[PDB]
């Protein structure tokens, strides 16, 4: 049961900076044949992981030379020479020297960029959805940074709670920003019970909380 | 061209069985030890099994040892994984993998086939238009989208204009609802002054239920 | 986020006019000089026009002076390109661009809009399946595709399974036949043991002839 | 009047290699304000160009520092200190100083990798097409390198000529290989006048020409 521990669990750096991730095994990981099969993998949402480094320092064919690996004993490190927006992904180390083979917990890698205010759009329930008997109001926060953001719903000035859910996209591989969606769900009868709907967005790039709304 | 394609994943009830398949091509299958690796929703990677090219040497981690069985048909370049006594905890995406003669474990992977162990039944999504309007417009920008509501299990794929539209596109990760069904929203921003100039269609795909919807979003 | 989107491109006969529009969002339109750049098929880029944010200052390369007229509406974030007396040569993709305050010319581009000036008549394509068989198989790899034949003019967009299928796909560059029509093929490889493990449908779009066709491809032959 | 000449038309180089593209201006291209608005662009097929270098050596934001630009007088250069697979594209210089503005003719940058033999597939014509009065036979060469490949059509052993067209994809952005298609086109009449159709592929990764064929009817 050789455990693999990476550090840190997540880290952010500027496009161009050098970054390093460490992986430590609870016991030496040298195969009986002498090789040390410590590998490094990179994965992004919905995709299969990609092998980067194997046998400690071997770069798999097709992997950029700005990635490298090193180490021995119980401590190993993965390094990216000049971080880029497309390296936004999760990185795990793997050990195949001792069965059962084990993966590290993974390390998330983000990009540090300048703050960027979010654009805010609100979407009332569609007509064809109401005939379904339910009503979903959607609030959208587009291309902002940092990720922290507060989204509050207000029905006739009453702040909502427990009836909305938000989802956040992965840090964009281009402008290194985030987008988010907050969805307020109500039944058709309840929804038809009020007039004004609105989401209040508070983010660092905004001089003060921004609000978007409609009433029908 | 090394290619690996898994299949067989579906919704299965706890205690019942499921058998996954892995079809390969582009290399001498018979010369390589094959592997299965899984990833539970929101979790890390986990090695599930391995099998020698010949000799039937196999092994697994204690979590599936006794319930799972890896096997292969070298005559049809096919790796299998019999999964018996499935538990909710076995839910996740299952990947087929192949290494290299010189030492790496997982050099080439398949797209992965989804497995959901639950007593719940599959459920196609309803697709509703998030029409661009004066309320969906902001800093010269207009927003439009599609709400993919109430489906099960994961996952759902989304494209715009058959994959031709990708600029300004944001497909959010799914969210489990109290009802126990997932909901997903996909959006795109476009300069408002162009509204009425282009056609927008979200091609939604929920394979687990063989449901396909191509909703047109109109201002 | 900075966005640019062109529209209005089309197929036109020599001598006609066409009006292109570029709608922008994500920045202060009235603050920048705007550009139009085009690309003839298989050729390089060519600057076509520019206009001052304010002041109506314009200019164009000699090839279009007198026929093309750039203009804007700082109130609708829109840039225009009036194209009068088109010529076969004006055939190509027209892009909208915007630079940066510190000396950049084309820092942000639109996706582009296709324009074709021809006396030849528009023609939609036929879509025949390239059925996977044992002749389509090789080293455990099966191959299948679709053939997009005899159409005019460019371009034709092709996708598989409405976008859900992209791995192993090869959509070849169009090739002009002696007939005067274009033709291209889109194919995809898969392990033999698959096939039936999913369906395969090509999606063929040819806007000039209002063609949007989906063609399911299934096994046959030996 | 001011012509911009890029060199070379195309160049191939191994991964990690250094790369230099040059662009010469007919006259001195230094703007009346003092600057030299010489720019460098990168463009992939069916896509808009991307700005990498402006003002001769300023790197546009988000542009990897491995790309650089320098020069003066009439000789300017674009540099890539460590070529990578994703860099396969066409690069153009641009002169914005003295009017009228012009682009270089461009440079195609390919990658140099290990020889990969192609897989060959042949497709008989579809019945729908035959009814049309014409028949098209397609020979497909999948994922191979180098690009050079001789595809020959033989009908009943009669070597064909002048009745087929070839099309090659862009060098793949991941495995650095090419794919190709050759289409033999005949009328139904002449097509039904023969039995065996075959395309013989000669490539550096093949010891002897690989021939794929079928018989109008059944194998
Ligand atoms: C192409 C192939 O399948 N080769 C196998 C070889 O597997 C390869 O090498 C190992 C180290 C690993 O990187 C595989 O992914 C790769 O395909 C086999 O090696 C065994 O592999 C299993 C699976 O992980 C175990 O790791 C086992 O310990 C390995 O054996 C050790 O390494 C070998 C290279 C020999 O030194 C052996 O004596 C060691 O015990 C071997 C079977 O050993 O068979 C092909 O070579
Ligand atoms: Zn209420
Ligand atoms: Zn966005
Ligand atoms: Zn291929
Ligand atoms: Zn004949």
Residue numbers in the entry:
A (entry chain L): 1 to 216
B (entry chain H), D (entry chain A): 1 to 219
C (entry chain B): 1 to 222
From the paper:
Clinical studies with hu3S193 in a variety of Ley-expressing cancer patients have demonstrated that this antibody does not induce human anti-humanized antibody (HAHA) responses, selectively targets and accumulates in Ley-expressing tumors at high concentrations, retains immune effector function in vivo, and does not show saturable binding to any normal tissue compartment. The preferential binding of hu3S193 to tumor cells with high surface densities of Ley and lack of binding to normal tissues expressing lower levels of Ley suggests that this antibody is involved in carbohydrate cluster recognition as a first step in tumor cell killing. Herein we report three-dimensional structures of both the free (unliganded) and bound (Ley tetrasaccharide) hu3S193 Fab in the same orthorhombic P212121 crystals, which were grown in the presence of divalent zinc ions.
The Ley ligand either was not bound or was eluted from Fab2 during transfer to the cryoprotectant, but the Fab2 binding site represents the unliganded or free hu3S193 Fab. The Fab2 binding site is contains a few solvent molecules and a glycerol (GOL) molecule, which is weakly held in place by a single water-mediated hydrogen bond. Overlays of the hu3S193 Fab structures (two in complex with Ley and one unliganded Fab) demonstrate almost identical positions for all binding site residues in contact with the Ley tetrasaccharide. Comparison of the free and bound Fabs shows that the binding site of hu3S193 does not undergo significant changes during complex formation. The only notable difference is the absence in the Fab1-Ley complex of a single hydrogen bond between Asn 28L (ND2 atom) and the Ley-specific Fuc (O4 atom) saccharide unit (ie., the α1–2 linked Fuc). Without the Ley ligand, the hu3S193 binding site contained 4 ordered water molecules and a glycerol. One water molecule in the unliganded hu3S193 binding site occupied a location (near tyrosines 32H and 33H) where the N-acetyl group of the Ley tetrasaccharide binds and could have been displaced during complex formation. For the present complex (Fab1-Ley) that was determined at a resolution of 2.5 Å, we identified two of the same bridging water molecules and these were buried in the carbohydrate-antibody interface. The hu3S193 Fab molecules contain four Zn2+ ions bound in two types of environment. Firstly, protein interface zinc-binding sites are formed between the Fab1 and Fab2 molecules and involve the tetravalent coordination by Fab residues.
